[PDB]
């Protein structure tokens, strides 16, 4: 029979660990790092892109960044070809909701609905789960500013700071060291860069390889903005916080 | 009985120098009783509009499907849509449902982005679209907007002068319908900025 | 009877890895070389025509492949895979999107169509993934042109140049020395046609090298004259004369 | 490496299905069966092992008959034969239905060959037990067929399955040699009973009961029929005659 | 070996054998003797039942299919009953569409065929018991013996289940005895209790351990259990 | 409407006029019912036009499918069995009725649908309401082994009896030649003879003749 | 229409007038209602022209599959192939069918399926609104065995009287010659047979 | 993880085992056919062995008429060879009924080799042990030889031949194209083209046949037939009076 060549990627250990979701978070833990700090004023996604040529079209690309809503986007952390269907999906459980209510949809209930899917793979249906981790960096008129983070097993959770990927050990302490409260997105900002230039397993930390964004309720306004940086913007910005 | 007799209403389009306009009426009725005088057949996606007449509940389906559509596009594609897109987009959309259709006459408007030409686009219930040069008109006053229009219209108004002719076009089809009229709202459309103007008419 | 495969054939290992993406890609390694070139006016796609045999005829298989009038394809690896891969590939672009709006998908999003299939290939049950990596070229009105890589595992890059296959290191290398942002087509021709000279181990023309560029409309190549809007497809392969041309000026 | 066998649709590294092949074995180890096409049809016969004096006399018939111009006999899992010929029945109704004419010897070959050949396109099927010998006649003359577990089967002069094929085997060759003018539908039901008789004794062991039927233009108008009574008797005889 | 080549009905061993199969036909010799006989106006059925404890009832081993047709089981009872089942509903089905009683050698080729599928596909398991199905139809008195192998044969008598190599070869020598006890059926039962108890061992049937039916030419399908078996024992 | 196809020596012509009714309101004055199915298969379409036109696109679609995955020029009869066989599933129920025509590596075709799934073949045919004037004039002008240049004018004069006949008819005529070894030609507005006159008065408005009870500026940028 | 099969000595020759009409209009005055179904077989159509043709083409798809495996099939196997379509689908389908094939051991063959699905083999048969006018005609006039020059007539004769009362029937006359020598087409136009 | 010989997934060295053994099963029938292009003709031969006494010679073929148009050559089991030729004849029916025209040989051969390439990459489902050489005089390529294997590959050949002695044929007919320095045989009569056909496989093989050691097929324009025994003494004969 067919049996014979099952993996039977939804078990448990005898220890009462998912073994495919260990895997998988294995496999995440050697992915670009990226990185999410919120602060009063806005939220910042930072992300180091894994892997560069001097050939790679850097202002046509976009691998970690992604905008699911205009005020909700997240940083991926693993398979990119996975994390796109799953991003595909949340766009239009987004538009779904809109849709229904003539509301955008709260923050949560979109990272929710996200993490029940992989909860699914997890559960049932005898598939791999998908590789893939996420920091959503999103705003709504019912919790304002929210950072979660969502991995292969379905769980959830809030952040003020946190991150994905790579050497998230070095990075979580270095953020728990220097984040503060009253934090501003111009601060946020730097602390992100920082804390990527102290945890690249890389020689330095330039524009080329990375991806930036941030969402804030530009004064001026009244609205909610979300500005993915182009390759010039971050270039810049490297420059001032003092990383040239 | 029929669908499109039962709200009311009509939307008319046309193109300009450099320029196009879409106005509609504000009635919504059940047959000869008027409920609401605010209900607005005008709708945008980023720099595109659609008017729709026919059954008010279709209307406000068909935008909020468009509005969906149009969302998921813009997040693809990374680039608003254009008029002559959405135009397609809304013909399959129609013909989707072609043996139980949306009753409704969709009108589309705007200027190309990138070529700057003004496009303005009709469509039967099934999708059939209609792209006409000079104007197009939709509603319970088809037949009144018509003859207006073949009249009144002229090619390369400005938008001053466009503003005049749609808003006369509109206001003296709708005061020889019995389901149009209880306010009027028109929009002048340019590659820059677009004005609204709510009209002054007869409110019975 | 019926596929009772309906577990996943590609799965976690305890380092990470997904092992059939790692041996799919180990099967590209293994197929003749083939290139992508980005010019400031069009982009180019080459490979060689490793005939298996001399009483096969070269041209009855084509390496190169139109997708869409604007945009082609070309690949390293397993052959047969891609051949379906072209069919999915053509048609998705009807499906999802030229019967929706009436026009041709923008090399991208057929790309993330592409792409959507071959990550499917990766989790879906009683499959294995497809042993290929394409690289697609193409044009469209907002985007200019374009070139992608299409890997086992459904992960896609834009490119200005690359090589993909046996020789593609050195190749890679190579590109990277005659690469600048003001190539035009002939120029990136010219470089496509070196970079592959160094992979071909034997006889080197116009009949065992394949290559198509993405560049100008080819109102010639349209079949028919009436409407203004349709100026004909920026895809084209070229012939085996032209290339032959080419490379007496190499 | 090993375990190419232990599953129906793969292949070997020499390119062989060893489950087909083992299926050949259970074959191998049943009753010996016959089958002897004359020059106006063609005639069938079995080897009944008696088990012992209860098997009520005659009554466990072996060959069945398939529309009504077609008989079947087969070696090895009886089950899995009746199986086979249950399908045929469906097969030669279809083809009646649709096309009026009853069912040709070679097509009717053919669907029974596609039936079997699918059984070892998959690992959740098992290869059929059973090699059958079948035919009759049609539009064009008499048909004699022999089908392996493989699927594959070809038209025959004189067939032979089971236990004691060899000798049968060896009998029918010796026909074919001694009769390039062909075997008369009365001669072929002796010899049949005959090559029966004689390839018993790979079995000689047990006692036996011994069934033919045929199917001839002149003998039977071309319907397929159990020897009977005197013809059956007769051949018994001319068989137990020259077994000494 | 056979470790390799048991562990499912879709696997043939090298040798050709369906171990799944086999190792069904084991469950059956597990089972309790039950033996069945007939002559020409008649059939009988002899089943030795079972009990668990001293507390429990011995269970019932033979079931009615139609009023011209029923069997005795031997190894699963659950599977008895879903092969009993099928029976009596293609009894059903014959006399409801065709209003003809179903040929008991037709039954037999029903049984074997649906035995069969169960022994070429993934997934299900051989059924696990043994039957021996007696009636009287519009060619006399009959006896078959199926095996879960798909295998069923018409006898003038056999027995299946523990011991029952014993009552068997006793009607293998009472055979042209019992063939002509036509027009009496007390002397078919008894010829049946007599060859039941050619594999007795362990002790001598009872009035709660004994059951018989029978059928035959102006006999519906009966069963007899306790009191109306006494006087056989 | 009027619908034509017209076979000449060396290929085959079809022509139209551009009028699209609602009931008795012309809903547009110069529609196009000339469709393309690949480049060398034209189609001309009656009936109702969100299905010549659905109709046209879905099998086109599958056509040039079909071409790419047999490196083959699209046949004529290709899109005529694929139309067919749709609008026979759809029992009527799809109001396609067309003239189906073009050069393929067999030669020059010319044939006809109607709705219900049934097709034709002839030298000259037409459909439409206009349908029997302008069989009137290819009844009487029609001749074997026709030049391009006859042919033209022949559908170009059927139409024109549509036109002026034809109540369902009007505007202009719109004609496409399919010729054996060139490109199809598309000839959009070939003839426009129904011109609208000048207009006796200008009816530009003053500005400010509307009363306006409020204004505002409409926000596109997001 | 008027549509006729009829067998002979050497064979069967099918004929048919070649109108088809939308009420008054004649929407098709030089239609071709012989269908070929294969080599030798082939049919006469009536009733619904949208069916015929579906049902015809169906059947060519299907014998041709037949051929592909099993050889050249017998008129009455395509027959049976037309009737299973007729019979299974009549609520949807308006079709009068006439089959006649020529087989070298069967010569010439004829099969009528009318309305219900049912079939009809008969040494020649006539359908088609037209047919009602030659029914005393054809019965009087028919005989078996005639050669091919008698029965062209009796054909053209027939259908003529056809074409002459029937609105619904008119244009020309085509024949399909069907025997060992092969197949032969033939045309009438009306000077010739207006005057018969 | 030793099961990536077992069903069709990649081994290590991104290998498909299950598609290598599938070729190895080609050359079990121990036949060698070859195809050959004439000027308006397409011809294929196949040595034809029948050794029980006891088989009906008439029955054994590896060559099947797929259309009127259609011809097909086998390498490899009967089962599996039969279940090919009855899937390309459905195919080529229902393409005629669907588009209108004859389905071409090169677009038959893609087909099926598109329906291997699937058996190739979907477990469940295991390749076929055969090599599909189709043949034909297509209307608008002319004749035409297009060969599929396990792998879901296919190419047009100019020739070609295949089975356990396919390098032999191979490289004669190689020789001879390198000599005529021309891509078929210019003979006006698939009678000489056949003629030309066994020759080659004559010399190649290093063997002579009688009439029943082979079978032919030949594809010209509209049609495909296989010759018989006594069709292809008169062709042993023709080839005798030149040696
Ligand atoms: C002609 O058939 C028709 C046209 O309005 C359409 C328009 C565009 C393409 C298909 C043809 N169709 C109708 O239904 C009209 C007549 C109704 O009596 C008209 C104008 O003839
Ligand atoms: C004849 O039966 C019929 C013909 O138009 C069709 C045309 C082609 C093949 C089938 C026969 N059928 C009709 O319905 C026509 C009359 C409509 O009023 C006519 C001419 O009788």
Not at chain 4, 15 to 25: H, I, L, M, P, T
Not at chain 8, 75 to 104: Q, T, V
Request: aromatic share 8%; hydrophobic share 35%; net charge negative.
């Amino acid at each position: 029979g067919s049996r014979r060549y099952d993996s039977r990627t939804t078990i448990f250990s005898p220890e009462g660990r998912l073994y495919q979701v260990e895997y998988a978070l294995e496999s995440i833990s050697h992915a670009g790092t990226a990185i999410g700090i919120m602060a009063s004023d806005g939220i910042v996604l930072a992300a180091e892109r894994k892997v560069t040529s001097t050939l790679l079209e850097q202002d046509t690309s976009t691998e970690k960044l992604y905008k699911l809503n205009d005020k909700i986007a997240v940083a991926v952390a693993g398979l990119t070809a996975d994390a796109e269907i799953l991003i595909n999906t949340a766009r239009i459980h987004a538009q779904n909701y809109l849709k229904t209510y003539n509301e955008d949809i709260p923050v949560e209930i979109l990272v929710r609905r996200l993490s029940d899917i992989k909860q699914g793979y997890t559960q049932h249906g005898g598939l791999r789960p998908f590789g893939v981790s996420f920091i959503y960096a999103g705003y709504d008129d019912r919790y304002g500013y929210q950072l979660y983070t969502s991995n292969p097993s379905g769980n959830y959770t809030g952040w003020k700071a946190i991150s994905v990927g790579a050497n998230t050990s070095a990075a979580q302490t270095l953020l728990q060291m220097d984040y503060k409260d009253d934090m501003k997105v111009d601060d946020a900002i730097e602390l992100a860069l920082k804390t990527l230039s102290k945890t690249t397993d890389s020689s330095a930390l330039t524009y080329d390889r990375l991806e930036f964004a941030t969402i804030r309720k530009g004064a001026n306004d009244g609205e909610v903005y979300q500005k993915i940086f182009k390759p010039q913007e971050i270039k810049d910005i490297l420059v001032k916080t003092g990383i040239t | 009985s029929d669908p499109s007799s039962i709200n009311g209403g009509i939307v008319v389009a046309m193109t300009g120098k450099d320029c196009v306009a879409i106005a509609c009426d504000l009635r919504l009725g059940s047959q000869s009783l008027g409920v609401s005088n605010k209900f607005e057949k005008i709708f945008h996606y980023g720099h595109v509009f659609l008017g729709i007449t026919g059954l008010a509940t279709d209307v406000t389906t068909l935008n909020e499907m468009f509005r969906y559509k149009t969302n998921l596009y813009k997040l693809k594609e990374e680039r608003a849509i254009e008029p002559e897109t959405f135009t397609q987009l809304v013909s399959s959309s129609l013909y989707e449902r072609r043996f139980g259709p949306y009753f409704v006459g969709p009108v589309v408007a705007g200027i190309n982005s990138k070529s700057g030409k003004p496009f303005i686009a009709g469509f039967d219930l099934i999708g059939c679209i209609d792209e006409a040069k000079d104007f197009i008109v939709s509603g319970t006053a088809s037949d009144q907007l018509f003859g207006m229009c073949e009249s009144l219209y002229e090619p390369n108004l400005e938008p001053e002068d466009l503003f005049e002719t749609i808003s006369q076009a509109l206001l003296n089809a709708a005061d020889r319908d019995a389901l149009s009229g209880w306010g009027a709202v028109v929009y002048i459309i340019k590659k820059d900025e677009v004005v609204k103007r709510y009209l002054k008419m007869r409110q019975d | 009877m019926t596929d009772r495969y309906s577990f996943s054939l590609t799965t976690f290992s305890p380092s990470g890895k997904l092992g059939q993406i790692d041996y799919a890609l180990t099967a590209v390694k293994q197929g003749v070389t083939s290139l992508g070139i980005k010019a400031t006016n069009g982009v180019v796609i080459a490979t060689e025509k490793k005939s298996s045999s001399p009483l096969a005829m070269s041209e009855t298989l084509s390496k190169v492949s139109l997708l869409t009038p604007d945009i082609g394809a070309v690949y390293s690896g397993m052959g047969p895979d891609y051949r379906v891969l072209v069919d999915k590939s053509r048609k998705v672009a009807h499906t999802s999107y030229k019967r929706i709006y009436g026009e041709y998908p923008p090399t991208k999003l057929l790309v993330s169509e592409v792409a959507k299939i071959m990550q499917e290939a990766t989790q879906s049950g009683g499959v294995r993934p497809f042993g290929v990596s394409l690289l697609i070229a193409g044009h469209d009105e907002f985007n200019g042109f374009s070139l992608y890589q299409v890997d086992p595992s459904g992960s896609y890059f834009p490119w200005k140049a690359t090589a993909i296959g046996k020789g593609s290191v050195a190749a890679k290398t190579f590109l990277e020395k005659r690469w600048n942002d003001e190539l035009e087509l002939e120029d990136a021709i010219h470089i496509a046609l070196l970079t592959l000279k160094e992979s071909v181990e034997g006889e080197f023309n116009g009949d065992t090298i394949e290559l198509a560029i993405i560049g100008d409309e080819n109102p010639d190549l349209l079949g028919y004259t009436g409407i203004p809007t349709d100026k004909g497809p920026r895809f084209r392969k070229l012939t085996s004369q032209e290339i032959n041309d080419r490379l007496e000026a190499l | 490496g090993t375990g190419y066998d232990l599953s129906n649709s793969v292949f070997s590294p020499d390119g062989r299905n060893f489950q087909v092949e083992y299926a050949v074995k259970a074959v191998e180890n049943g009753t010996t069966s016959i089958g002897i096409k004359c020059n106006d049809g063609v005639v069938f016969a079995v080897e009944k092992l008696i088990t012992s004096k209860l098997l009520v006399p005659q009554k466990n018939v072996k060959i069945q008959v398939v529309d009504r111009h077609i008989g079947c006999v087969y070696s090895g899992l009886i089950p899995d034969g009746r199986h086979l010929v249950n399908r045929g029945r469906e097969e030669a109704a279809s083809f009646k239905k649709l096309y009026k004419t009853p069912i040709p010897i070679p097509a009717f070959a053919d669907r029974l060959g596609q039936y079997v050949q699918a059984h070892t396109l998959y690992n959740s099927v098992r290869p059929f037990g059973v090699s059958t010998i079948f035919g009759g006649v049609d539009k064009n003359g008499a048909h004699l067929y022999m089908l392996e577990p493989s699927g594959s089967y070809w038209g025959y002069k004189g067939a032979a399955t089971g236990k004691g094929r060899q000798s049968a085997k060896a009998e029918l060759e010796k026909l074919v040699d001694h009769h390039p003018e062909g075997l008369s539908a009365r001669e072929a039901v002796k010899q049949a009973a005959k090559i029966i008789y004689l390839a018993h004794e790979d079995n000689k062991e047990k006692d036996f009961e011994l069934e033919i039927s045929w199917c001839s233009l002149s003998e039977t108008n071309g319907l397929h029929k159990f020897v009977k009574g005197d013809l059956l008797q007769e051949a018994i005889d001319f068989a137990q005659k020259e077994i000494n | 070996f056979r470790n390799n080549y048991d562990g499912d009905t879709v696997t043939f061993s090298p040798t050709g054998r369906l171990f799944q199969v086999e190792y069904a036909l084991e469950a059956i010799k597990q089972g309790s003797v039950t033996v069945g006989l007939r002559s020409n106006t008649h059939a009988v059925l002899v089943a030795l039942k079972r009990n668990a404890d001293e507390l429990s009832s011995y269970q019932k081993k033979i079931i009615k299919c139609d009023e011209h047709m029923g069997l005795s089981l031997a190894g699963l009872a659950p599977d008895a009953r879903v092969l009993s089942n099928y029976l009596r509903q293609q009894c059903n089905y014959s006399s409801l569409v065709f209003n003809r009683k179903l040929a008991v050698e037709r039954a037999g080729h029903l049984l074997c065929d649906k035995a069969q599928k169960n022994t070429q596909s993934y997934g299900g398991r051989p059924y696990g018991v043994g039957l021996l199905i007696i009636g009287y139809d519009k060619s006399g008195a009959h006896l078959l013996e199926f095996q879960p192998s798909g295998n069923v044969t018409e006898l003038y008598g056999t027995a299946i289940g523990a011991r029952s190599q014993g009552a068997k070869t006793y009607l293998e020598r009472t055979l042209d005895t019992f063939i002509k006890i036509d027009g009496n059926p007390d002397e078919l039962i008894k010829a049946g209790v007599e060859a039941i108890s050619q594999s007795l061992r362990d002790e001598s049937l009872t009035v709660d351990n004994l059951s018989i039916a029978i059928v035959g030419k102006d006999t519906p399908f009966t069963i007899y259990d306790g009191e109306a078996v006494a006087k056989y024992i | 409407t009027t619908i034509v196809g017209v076979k000449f020596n060396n290929g085959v012509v079809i022509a139209a006029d551009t009028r699209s009714t609602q009931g008795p309101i012309v809903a547009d004055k110069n529609c196009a019912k000339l469709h393309r199915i690949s480049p060398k298969i034209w189609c001309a379409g009656a009936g109702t036009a969100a299905d010549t036109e659905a109709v046209t696109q879905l099998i086109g679609s599958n056509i040039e499918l079909h071409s790419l995955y047999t490196s083959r020029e699209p046949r004529v009869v290709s899109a005529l069995q694929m139309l067919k066989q749709h609008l026979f599933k759809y029992q009527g129920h799809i109001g396609a009725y067309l003239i189906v025509a073009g050069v393929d590596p067999t030669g020059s075709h010319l044939f006809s649908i109607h709705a219900h799934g049934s097709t034709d073949v002839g030298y000259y045919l037409s459909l439409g309401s206009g349908s029997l004037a302008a069989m009137a004039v290819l009844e009487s002008h029609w001749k074997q082994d026709l030049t391009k240049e006859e042919a033209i004018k022949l559908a170009s004069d059927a139409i024109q009896a549509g036109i002026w006949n034809d109540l369902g008819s009007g505007s202009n005529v719109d004609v496409c030649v399919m010729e054996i070894g060139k490109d199809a030609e598309y000839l959009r507005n070939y003839l426009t003879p129904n011109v609208r006159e000048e207009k006796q008065k200008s009816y530009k408005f003053p500005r400010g003749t509307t009363a306006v009870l409020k204004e505002s500026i409409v926000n596109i940028c997001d | 229409t008027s549509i006729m099969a009829v067998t002979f000595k050497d064979g069967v020759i099918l004929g048919a007038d070649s109108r088809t009409t939308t009420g008054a209009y004649i929407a098709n005055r030089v239609t071709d209602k012989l269908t070929r179904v294969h080599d030798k077989i082939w049919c006469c159509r009536s009733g619904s022209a949208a069916d015929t043709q579906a049902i015809a083409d169906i059947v060519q798809y299907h014998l041709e599959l037949y051929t592909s495996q099993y050889g050249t099939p017998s008129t009455e196997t395509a027959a049976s192939v037309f009737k299973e379509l007729c019979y299974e689908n009549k609520d949807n389908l308006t079709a009068g069918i006439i089959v006649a094939g020529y087989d070298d051991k069967n010569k010439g063959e004829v099969y009528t399926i009318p309305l219900g699905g049912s079939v009809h083999k008969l040494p020649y048969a006539i359908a088609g609104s037209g047919s009602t006018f030659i029914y005393g005609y054809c019965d009087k006039n028919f005989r078996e065995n005639m050669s091919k020059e008698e029965t062209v007539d009796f054909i053209k004769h027939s259908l003529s009287q056809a074409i002459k009362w029937d609105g619904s029937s008119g244009g020309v006359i085509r024949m399909v010659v069907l025997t060992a020598a092969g197949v032969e087409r033939l045309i009438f136009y009306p000077d010739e047979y207006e005057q018969l | 993880a030793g099961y990536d010989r077992h069903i069709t997934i990649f081994s290590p060295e991104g290998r498909l085992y299950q598609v290598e053994y599938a070729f190895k099963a080609t050359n079990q029938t121990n036949i060698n056919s070859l195809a050959v292009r004439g000027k308006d003709c397409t011809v294929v031969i196949s040595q034809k062995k029948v050794p029980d006494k006891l088989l009906d010679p008439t029955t054994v073929s590896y060559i099947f008429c797929i259309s009127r148009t259609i011809g097909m050559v086998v390498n490899g089991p009967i089962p599996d060879a039969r279940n090919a030729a009855l899937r390309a004849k459905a195919e080529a029916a229902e393409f005629r009924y669907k588009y209108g025209y004859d389905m071409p040989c090169d677009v038959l051969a893609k087909r099926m080799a598109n329906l291997s390439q699937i058996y190739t990459q979907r477990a469940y489902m295991r390749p076929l042990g055969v090599i599909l050489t189709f043949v034909s005089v297509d209307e608008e390529l002319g004749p035409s030889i297009y060969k599929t294997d396990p792998a879901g590959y296919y190419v047009g050949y100019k020739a070609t031949a295949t089975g356990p002695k396919q390098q032999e044929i191979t490289t004669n007919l190689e020789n001879h194209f390198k000599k005529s320095k021309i891509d078929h045989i210019n003979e006006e009569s698939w009678e000489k083209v056949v003629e030309f056909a066994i020759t080659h496989m004559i010399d190649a093989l290093g063997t002579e046949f009688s009439k029943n050691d082979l079978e032919v097929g030949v594809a010209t324009k509209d049609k495909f037939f296989t010759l018989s025994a006594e069709n292809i003494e008169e062709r042993l004969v023709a080839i005798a009076e030149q040696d």
